[PDB]
Amino acid sequence: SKLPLLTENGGRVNRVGFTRIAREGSIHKFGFFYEFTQESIDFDSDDGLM
Amino acid sequence: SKLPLLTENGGRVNRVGFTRIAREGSIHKFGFFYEFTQESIDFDSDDGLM
Numbered sequence: 673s674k675l676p677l678l679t680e681n682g683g684r685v686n687r688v689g690f691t692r693i694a695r696e697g698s699i700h701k702f703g704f705f706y707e708f709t710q711e712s713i714d715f716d717s718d719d720g721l722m
Numbered sequence: 723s724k725l726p727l728l729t730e731n732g733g734r735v736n737r738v739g740f741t742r743i744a745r746e747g748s749i750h751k752f753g754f755f756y757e758f759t760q761e762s763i764d765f766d767s768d769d770g771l772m
Contacts, residue, residue, distance in 0.1 A: 704726045704736035718742075 676686040713721060726736040763771065 701728045702726050703728045703732060704738060706738045 678685060708722075728735060
């Protein structure tokens with residue numbers, strides 16, 4: 673039913689159009705830490721704990 | 723739920739810790755013996771019993 677058919681003498685019969693689509697992404701930040709005291713590393717039995 | 727996330731100013735946000743474990747083992751002592759006489763060696767049928 674929807675085939676583009678052209679007459680012997682044709683003008684302005686079939687037109688087409690186009691579109692475009694956009695996509696996106698984002699960024700985030702993470703982190704964590706830990707704490708200690710000098711006495712802990714100084715009096716500990718195991719050297720090289722850090 | 724428990725992911726570490728950061729804002730621009732991150733103060734005292736995520737903290738962690740650590741642990742260690744110890745193992746052990748010991749030793750023991752075993753032994754047994756036997757005894758004989760001189761006649762049992764001198765008068766026996768075959769030499770090389772020892």
